[PDB]
């Protein structure tokens, strides 16, 4: 159907200007303006303003108008927003929604996002770490392996048990921030007959500075 | 401006039952309400506009009501993978006023946690760091209590907790307890014991070590 894509994820900090964009696939960009809503972790989701992707006119929630400037690349049937003279205040995950109608009071479809950090932090790619068991019975027929990644900036970070291909049992938890950088644990229950018998693998990219990691868990035990 | 306001900002019921969710405005805004669902890491999706018209396709099971002021989406069958936000949004004048979402958690059956405790590994202690890691697992409810205690005594910084939000799949929980120390930290030490306070015992469940083989 309709299948709006968004920019990858931005760092930037105070004072610069960012470029957020949404490519329309699946309708005729111009007879439905674009809508873009921020979500904040906070208030919840909070409208920016429309565009109407016709003649080219915007419209701007009060918050908005003056730093935010809604655009188009009418031939690529993209939308951009564009935050100048950032502010810690605007570290948050954006939006542009489909106006379903005339000023977008409806959105039908919305793309998948775009986060931006504005901070002043170092990229500082993570240390990656195989955390594998002492001894003891694991609940029952199985062990637990983990990884911890540890040192990275900014937030994303993709990890991965043996390629993708081991799925059931993972628990990755979110990443939490310790002042400069962020720390992420995964957890992956095998069956006793699995490990060390199989190859369990932390495979982790860290996109943001072109890290990519694959700690095995040697047993160690 | 409108003002959506929502409360509760947590529901929960179980699997196949019905809830409900109030989203009252500041004025009569005449049916004119939208609603919709974001699940944890998705976009948002249009549940129904005018307070009762079902988008393509959401189920007959997702019901829209209200009026004047006051609104309500009820869904029922709550299946599992029920649980997001929900958020409703005037559409009566400019500007479309959200309001703050109401999250669904599934209330299931009780879940003793599942915890593992985790050595510092070689390799970051050649880096002169220790970590010892605890993993609390797919408990159920959501009220995990995790100290750690070096040696016997609670040792109540370098810990970071970090929480699995509510499994699509089986309703429950996860937990993490990272809790950070130097080589010469660690190395002064010797028995390393989380705790777990959780509703599911009395008896609190303890995972503790130091090594040996295996």
């Known amino acids: 159907q309709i299948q709006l894509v968004q920019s990858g994820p931005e760092l930037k900090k105070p004072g610069e200007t960012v470029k957020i964009s949404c490519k329309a696939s699946?309708?005729?960009?111009?007879?439905?303006?674009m809508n873009w809503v921020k979500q904040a972790p906070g208030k919840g989701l909070k409208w920016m303003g429309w565009?109407?992707?016709?003649?080219?006119?915007?419209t701007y929630g009060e918050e908005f108008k003056g730093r935010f400037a809604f655009s188009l690349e009418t031939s690529a049937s993209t939308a951009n927003l564009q935050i100048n003279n950032l502010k810690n205040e605007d570290t948050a995950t954006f939006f542009c929604?489909?106006?379903?109608?005339?000023?977008?009071?409806?959105?039908?479809?919305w793309g998948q996002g775009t986060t931006v950090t504005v901070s002043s932090a170092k990229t500082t790619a993570p240390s990656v770490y195989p955390l594998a068991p002492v001894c003891g019975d694991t609940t029952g027929s199985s062990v637990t392996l983990g990884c911890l990644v540890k040192g990275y900036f900014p937030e994303p970070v993709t990890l991965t048990w043996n390629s993708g291909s081991l799925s059931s049992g993972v628990h990755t938890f979110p990443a939490v921030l310790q002042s400069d950088l962020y720390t992420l644990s995964s957890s992956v229950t095998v069956t006793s007959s699995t490990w060390p018998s199989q190859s369990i693998t932390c495979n982790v990219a860290h996109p943001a500075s072109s890290t990519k990691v694959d700690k095995k868990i040697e047993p160690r035990g | 401006d409108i003002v959506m306001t929502q409360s509760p900002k947590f529901m929960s019921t179980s699997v196949g039952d019905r809830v409900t969710i109030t989203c009252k405005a500041s004025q009569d805004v005449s049916t004119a309400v939208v609603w919709y669902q974001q699940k944890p890491g998705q976009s948002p999706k249009l549940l129904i506009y005018?307070?009762?018209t079902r988008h393509i396709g959401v189920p007959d099971r997702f019901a829209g009501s209200g009026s004047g002021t006051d609104y309500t989406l009820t869904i029922s069958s709550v299946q599992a993978e029920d649980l997001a936000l929900y958020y409703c949004?005037?559409?009566?004048?400019?500007?479309?006023?959200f309001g703050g979402g109401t999250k669904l958690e599934i209330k299931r059956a009780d879940a003793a946690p599942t915890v593992s405790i985790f050595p510092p590994s070689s390799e970051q202690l050649t880096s002169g760091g220790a970590s010892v890691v605890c993993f609390l697992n797919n408990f159920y409810p959501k009220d995990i209590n995790v100290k750690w205690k070096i040696d016997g005594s609670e040792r109540q910084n370098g810990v970071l907790n970090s929480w699995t939000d509510q499994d699509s799949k089986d309703s429950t929980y996860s937990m993490s307890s990272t809790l950070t120390l130097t080589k010469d930290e660690y190395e002064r030490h010797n028995s390393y014991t989380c705790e777990a306070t959780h509703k599911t015992s009395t008896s609190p469940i303890v995972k503790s070590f130091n090594r040996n083989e295996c």
């Open positions: 005018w307070a009762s």
């Open positions: 949004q005037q559409h009566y004048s400019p500007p479309w006023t």
């Open positions: 565009i109407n992707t016709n003649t080219g006119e915007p």
């Open positions: 929604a489909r106006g379903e109608d005339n000023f977008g009071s409806l959105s039908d479809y």
């Open positions: 699946g309708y005729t960009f111009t007879n439905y303006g």
